[PDB]
Amino acid sequence: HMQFDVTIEIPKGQRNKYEVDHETGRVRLDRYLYTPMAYPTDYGFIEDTLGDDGDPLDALVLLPQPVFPGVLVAARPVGMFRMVDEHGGDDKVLCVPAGDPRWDHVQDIGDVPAFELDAIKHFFVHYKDLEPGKFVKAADWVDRAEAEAEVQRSVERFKA
Amino acid sequence: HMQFDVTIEIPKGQRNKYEVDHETGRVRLDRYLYTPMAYPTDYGFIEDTLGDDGDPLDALVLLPQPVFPGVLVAARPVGMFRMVDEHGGDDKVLCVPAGDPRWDHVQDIGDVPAFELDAIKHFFVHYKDLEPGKFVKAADWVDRAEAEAEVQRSVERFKA
Amino acid sequence: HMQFDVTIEIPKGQRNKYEVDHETGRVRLDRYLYTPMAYPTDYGFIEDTLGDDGDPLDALVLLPQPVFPGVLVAARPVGMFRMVDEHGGDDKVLCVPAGDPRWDHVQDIGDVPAFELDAIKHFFVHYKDLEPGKFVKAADWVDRAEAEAEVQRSVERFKA
Amino acid sequence: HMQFDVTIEIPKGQRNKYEVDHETGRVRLDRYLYTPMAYPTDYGFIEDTLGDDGDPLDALVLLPQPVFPGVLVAARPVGMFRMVDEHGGDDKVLCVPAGDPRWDHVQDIGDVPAFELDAIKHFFVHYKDLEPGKFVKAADWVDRAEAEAEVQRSVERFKA
Amino acid sequence: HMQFDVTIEIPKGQRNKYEVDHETGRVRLDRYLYTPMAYPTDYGFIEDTLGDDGDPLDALVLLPQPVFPGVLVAARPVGMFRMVDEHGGDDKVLCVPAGDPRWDHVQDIGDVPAFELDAIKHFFVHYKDLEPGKFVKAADWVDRAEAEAEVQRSVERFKA
Amino acid sequence: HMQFDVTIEIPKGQRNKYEVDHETGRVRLDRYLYTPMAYPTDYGFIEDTLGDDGDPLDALVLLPQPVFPGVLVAARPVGMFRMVDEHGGDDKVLCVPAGDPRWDHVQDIGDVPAFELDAIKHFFVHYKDLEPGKFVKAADWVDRAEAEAEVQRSVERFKA
């Protein structure tokens, strides 16, 4: 039943790291990546969340065609990439479009093929390899229930 | 003499149906189309209108090169696709860029070739063929005068 | 076990109908489609076949990213779109990349979702709607065994 | 030390002249160019400036990959294209991304190759050749110090 | 009645000057243009011609969507850009797709708007402005009859 | 003085690994990469070479704009990425366009910034991380003289 709006900052296939300045809603180029890598899925954040790192809760959205930076997509969670890096906690909720029956076979983390999960993991483990002062201390996939709990606490913190 | 601003939601060639949330101005992905079709022209709505269905009045803009979702174009009407579907009234005002002399030969509906009008009609008749609970009860091209009258009543309703 | 080379003429998303002149191997623009439609998959033909219509046997290839006109892909069949139209027999063998374990769950026609099969069918039923003298008398999905038999007889005829 | 935010209106390679309506922040298509030319760099304006013509101060940003219309980039100046045309003063501050060590060899106007400066000049001298009532009375490259002084007076005027 | 095959070397919108090595049929990058310009139409040459400069006769093809380098298009002439430059004679036959009724209103040079002809001329007059040792001594539009005569003598020379 | 023709198989930014079948000259999709990586430069091979692994000698070409698969570029070497992996020797000659004065400041390996060399290295070290049975035993940059010697022995072997 859980769904939420994701703002996509970075379309799949991008090496330009876009993002939003959350005070204004403007889209910003943070940087061009230093590695020859590209975002593996459309990437952004869940609107109206205050996450575990004090930032909006990040999201990955599986789509048949990418969007543009700044576009909203109603999404539902199917799992989460738990990661601790130099920022601190840096989890990414894995999502599919909400209300779209083409995605109904994808309900939980076991419904996403390992080839896809492994490629996503590889991106986050390596994309900052050529930036100084970066590290990854934990990176693991967890299930929809864990994802939903993180979204829930982050919605509550935003409202608090 | 009539001109108005159109916000383009969907560039020509798109199968992603973008959209604007009119309460906020945000661009949203409504859905990926279920048919192997693509918008035949840049598509969006006329700013500051309250149309016949209680929604902003839709517009099609003929252009030499598409824009991006959310971009404004000053436009003038040359005709209108009158359609009744499952939404109710669902007219699309056909437009060209205002103030651009390259378009001065296009003044009314007879100035747009049948091949183009027929392709536009085909899109709207078929793009929802693989969605349940959709229908098209009337679909016909009408002239600039009819278009202008619809814009006019919709500008008035918005202001009311 | 069956695999073959497909030459892709038309990448997914194209309204330019490319395609090969089989006497020379050159890529040709046949025409821009008359409907606001776009090829639903990468599309082309199986090399070294002489099909049921006396032409190379057509193929559809499911891919994570389209190719360019003229590119070869080693493919294996998973089913076939049987169609009779104004050309005569006009079957399209549905394929996935051969030797790619990411596709191992797709073995036969039941492994491709109805939403995808229906969209492909819709394309072939409608893309010539605005061309004179076109028709579709039969259009149905059949299984891998039927596909393989058609490939086999077409390889034999080419060699004969 | 000087840096500022540039809003890119027009990505490198565009013939669509996008954009910002400064009263609302909306992106608008001004026009399709009348010449077969394309913006030589990402192009836009410096936020929070009131320039010599009473408009926001224009900026060119050198980048490894273009952005989208409306995107912010933190930039630092390395020189300026001084031009007087039919608008009046129409200077363009030449910039590189701020805080990006890949650009540290570019500090002043002599660090940008003549081939690049000449191509940029050529664009501004010629892109309006097929529009009536246009002219260019002065077009010359000046150094970072001149650029910084113009930015400074324009920041002050905006604040005044 | 005249038609011929054009090989498109350079799609509309390109700054890469592709392309064919006529001895092999391979596509080559000649150079990236030195000016911030882009080919105004799809551009290439007429197959099986030996033109006035001893090279294949160049062609411009008006299309609703560009092709890829190396693609053939059956075309018919509607006029010609006569030019003398540093190569010598350097005429470009202006064409539309043959057998395509969407183009039937375009028969001769007067059927192509001045805005389009002027933009094409502008490209050829200026694209080599920043290359040494280039010049344009004559550049004028001529009619279909002149174009057809040039094609005819070039077909004859190729065969001779 | 050394120059040669490179056939580009893979444009910069690609995750499709194109590719040439050297017996026919056809372009083939080998595979979609298994990692979220993209070729860091245009990539291909030097024509008329028989390299150290018994295959054509691979090349990387620095360009302002990518080409298409199968396109020739006259190139000159400026260094080489020496690598031993599961294939055996797998060197990539680093090149710039020959005869193009915009590249005259790039003569040897020290003229290419470390950020760029490091990104290229990162690609080759990591792009097969999620393929079984792959390894990299040596990966280092060497100078133009080493590159030229490898090209020379490979031209000789091809001719032998």
UniProtKB/Swiss-Prot annotation, chains A, B, C, D, E, F:
The protein's Enzyme Commission number: 3.6.1.1
Record-level Gene Ontology MF annotations: inorganic diphosphate phosphatase activity; magnesium ion binding
Superkingdom per UniProt: Bacteria
Broad EC category: hydrolase
GO cellular component, one term: cytoplasm
Binding, Mg(2+) 3: D85, D90
Catalytic activity as recorded in UniProt: diphosphate + H2O = 2 phosphate + H(+)
Amino-acid biosynthesis recorded as keyword: no
Binding, Mg(2+) 1: D53, D58, D90
Function summary: Catalyzes the hydrolysis of inorganic pyrophosphate (PPi) forming two phosphate ions.
Subunit structure and binding partners: Homohexamer.
Official protein name in the record: Inorganic pyrophosphatase
Annotated organism of origin: Mycobacterium tuberculosis (strain CDC 1551 / Oshkosh)
Gene that encodes the chain: ppa
